[PDB]
Amino acid sequence: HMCDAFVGTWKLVSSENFDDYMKEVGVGFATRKVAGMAKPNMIISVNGDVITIKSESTFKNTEISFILGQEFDEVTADDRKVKSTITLDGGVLVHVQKWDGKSTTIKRKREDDKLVVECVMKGVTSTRVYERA
């Protein structure tokens, strides 16, 4: 029910410090240049307790389906094989990805008409702002 604010089709409108975030998660030069150009969408839907987040882009297409609190395997757009757990902290979706003893945290929040994504690994923070399609 809290997930209702997130449901719909969203398209990337702005990006801050994303190159350095990609560097921190381990993305190489060529891939960062090509991925950096992409304008992914974010299609969020719900069926019972299952949340599905799909992203399509010229870089890579991804899809995850999950239940809140329940760890799952995810393959990220940059091909990390991660263990992911997504929880609701108030009305913020908090997504932790763990692999190879590392961790990154992705928060999705509604702010005005936007869906703001903050991505954090180590000292490095990037913001990806989406708006409704």
Ligand X SMILES: O=C(O)C1=C(C(=O)Nc2sccc2-c2ccccc2)CCC1
59 binds ligand X (CB under 6 A): yes
Distance of closest approach, residue 120 Cβ to ligand X, in angstroms: 11
Distance CA 11, CA 33 (A): 20
At residue 74, what is the residue type? E
Distance of closest approach, residue 34 Cβ to ligand X, in angstroms: 8
4-33 mask for ligand X (x: CB under 6 A)? ------------------x--x-x------
60-99 mask for ligand X (x: CB under 6 A)? ----------------xxx---------------------
The structure tokens 């992914």 sit at 40
37 or 50: CB nearest ligand X: 37
Cβ-based neighbours of 84, under 8 Å, separated by 6 or more: 64, 66, 71, 72, 73, 74, 95, 96, 97, 98
57 binds ligand X (CB under 6 A): yes
Question: In degrees rounded to 5, what are phi and psi of residue 123?
Answer: -85, 0
How many residues in total does the chain contain?
133
Q: Find how far residue 14's CA is from the centre of its chain.
A: 14
51 binds ligand X (CB under 6 A): no
Chain residues that interact with ligand X, rule: CB under 6 A: 22, 25, 27, 35, 38, 40, 55, 57, 59, 76-78, 106, 117, 119, 128
